[PDB]
């Protein structure tokens, strides 16, 4: 019943940050100046819980095909789990919206059990932020805003999202199984013509997951 | 904060309701029919040890599940800490049977929604689906996008709920349910805010 | 290698040892006579529910007395996840008595000692007193502190009976045990001006869960 | 069931670290050159977990009487908890051993909530290096014992001692994560397998964490 997931590995993992950029036109300093405080905010935490943080976004078009496949192919045998957040922006113009979705996809397909070995048996954690459906056996996909639900929108500190689970992270990282703190940020976000902001996890992982030191 | 919990210290645990998609289904055999009862008879002995108040019901009545439907909705849960909603079906599905259930989950959740339901507000909105959202749901499903004694998914489930339902935090309680299955791959989605104790 | 529990998976939670210290005892009030059997009764149930195999005995058989330790002590436990002693006595205590208990629970600890008992060796043994002995893997858990006021025995038993039960019934299935008997220590302490303060001390090694 | 006790205050607290050297007559390279790793790694690991820590020894017999009472009449009231390492060697004569058990007393009565308000439903930690006996206490104290009754103790090294070494090493990687008790038990384990058997007496009456600030 308190089975973990393993985490004693040589390595805990590549932590990667993409960043959604292209298709979108015009940014407010709040989007690009709040951008790159959530980019570098996550990068904080998730070194500081082990991780290889790897950033980039879609604009090098050349680059994003040498690193996506770089990433995909390397041997993460000696590595405890994976993470990537997918990050993105408020305005969304339709053709932004649906590229996301298409990414998101291919994104994820590249690191189930068939595609990669190296990671099976082993956490594959995607903290997406929204502008779903996806799945394989030891995924969690967290989510920025569940169904139809309003969104915080890009302040220049950063979204409330973004700005709340790196919050947690710092905070209760080490300490707190996963799921455990992403339902802290559930709470803190939906707290944040007025309503509510929810984000939402799926898990399929099939055990407990720590970040315990190293 | 961290370790804070929703408050089951209400009079009543609440409603847990177990409902049956039949209609639309053709061609049962036994492994359906008396599966099916294994999985709604164990479910009731589970939840009604965890407090719970079980109603079942079947969508063959099309007169009786309207007002039965309309009964739950309407119903006050204010002395209540919770909801439980279990969506059982087949695994032949025509397309109908198949169509049919997604819009029963719809609506059936849609009735909830805080919006819909102000004495749940608050209050964990439990949703465990046999395929074929809002603040504080939670929703367990059967299988992720992929017997006469019962379904594995109901089986495990029921089987954890006996031993740990008291003890364990309830997505604590899931994720077992996860492995025991995938070795026998169920998902769960989480908007809850807090933690999910059913102590005694 | 942080959150390593002892292994409770055998075939046989363990035995739960209640000793009831009753002799060079004269006096007993109803509430005495009858809040000892409130707490050896409630304790019975918990533990029990734990998957404790439950035997009590009292002092006044001396001669039952030895046939029965001794021979939980000889005893074989490598089916047992554990072993658990709960020491309970009275109030009043005449001084043959406070200082009989003293040399009683020795020898009852002294039985465990890796030395003495090789089936217990890796296992946790708990004993629950109503002091310095040990080993490693011992759990002492003290009805009050040094010097400390002490409950008084109720007809319902005593505060810390009463209430160690309480936890256990609740959470004694989910929660490590340390972590539930600081719980243990803070409901007794706001029992209600004198505070009644409960101790534990520990030699565990790891993590002690009782899951079904 | 998963109360703490609130550290949410300005300051963590004092990390008192108290060395006996008194009537202990000569000392090898190692007594001398172990203890200060031990001081040295202590005063590390606290200050990480952000308490002042402040060091001093019986020698200075003047010395003492001011750090000593001066820190038992501070005001604690900004602070989360009150910390006290004790410290001590291996060869102790018996003059050395009794005073120790002397020191021990004294130092643990001045924070009783009946002589210091201040820390009242506020975790006393004492970590004590054996050489009168163990038990004392209040309400919320944390007794964490180098070696339980009788039982063998393995002696001071160059690097200081296991005990030590161990609860420092665990502090470090574990400090801020876990439950106190919760760390204690790992250096039972830890220590046990370098037999010497640390213990630790709790009436702590909450959970726990050091989480930073």
Redesign the interface.
Known sequence: ????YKM?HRRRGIALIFNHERFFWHLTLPERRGTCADRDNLTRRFSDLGFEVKCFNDLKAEELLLKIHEVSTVSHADADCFVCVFLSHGEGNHIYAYDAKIEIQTLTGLFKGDKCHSLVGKPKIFIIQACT?????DFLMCYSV??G?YSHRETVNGSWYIQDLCEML???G????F??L???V??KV?QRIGK?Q???????????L?F???
């Open positions: 019943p308190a089975e973990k004693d459906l996806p799945a394989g056996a569940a169904e639900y710092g905070k209760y080490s300490s707190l199984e799921t455990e992403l339902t802290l559930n709470r939906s509510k929810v984000p939402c996890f799926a898990s399929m992982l099939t055990k407990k720590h315990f030191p190293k």
